[PDB]
Amino acid sequence: VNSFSGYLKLTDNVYIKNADIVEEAKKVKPTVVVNAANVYLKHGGGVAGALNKATNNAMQVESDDYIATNGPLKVGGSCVLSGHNLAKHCLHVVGPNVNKGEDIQLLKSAYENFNQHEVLLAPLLSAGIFGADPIHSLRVCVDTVRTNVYLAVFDKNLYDKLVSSFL
């Protein structure tokens, strides 16, 4: 038993809810919140910008030190940093950005990072300003992630379409 509430169960291990991931992290305080990161950990907009704003820019400060030490992530890769006031940990995961021409097949590799964590609060990778089809992203998620994932979908219209179109 865990504290995630009001989710619709899609499969054995994937759950979805129309919710603002920032508000959901502040309320649940999950072990892991997933950020929709880029390789530079520049949290400017979309989910990343929102999560970072909610940390009063502490996420960005920590991220800049990480990059200065380690260099950029790989598309499809991830790193674990602090969750600040939102979670114990933040898993920064880099899905491909279609608006940069990145290979959509890397979306499966991106979701594989979730399997290193028993339970996660997450957005749909590569959705939103990353330019991929969220229906495709949800399918890859369900077909790749084996651990327990609670997906927060900000847009109600998209959530309903994601739900009604789900096989």
Ligand X SMILES: CC(C)NC(=O)Nc1ccc(C(=O)N[C@@H]2c3cccc(O)c3C[C@@H]2C(=O)O)cc1
56: left (phi over 0), alpha (psi -120 to 50) or beta: left
Give how many residues touch ligand X by CB under 6 A.
16
Rounded Cα distance between 65 and 79, Å, is 13
79 token code pair = 């790193």
- Under the binding rule (CB under 6 A), the answer on residue 62 touching ligand X is no
Closer CB to ligand X, 45 or 70, in the complex: 45
Cβ partners under 8 Å of residue 69, min gap 6: none
Residues 96-135 that bind ligand X (CB under 6 A): 123-124, 127-128, 134
| Residue 14 binds to ligand X (criterion: CB under 6 A) | no
CB nearer ligand X, residue 69 or residue 154: 154
Buried b (16+ CB within 10 A) or exposed e, 82-100: ebbebbebbbbbbbbbbee
Nearest to ligand X by Cβ — which residue?
Answer: 128
Query: Residue 7 or residue 70: which is nearer to ligand X going by CB?
Result: 7
Binding site for ligand X (CB under 6 A): 20-22, 46-47, 50, 54, 123-124, 127-128, 134, 153-155, 158
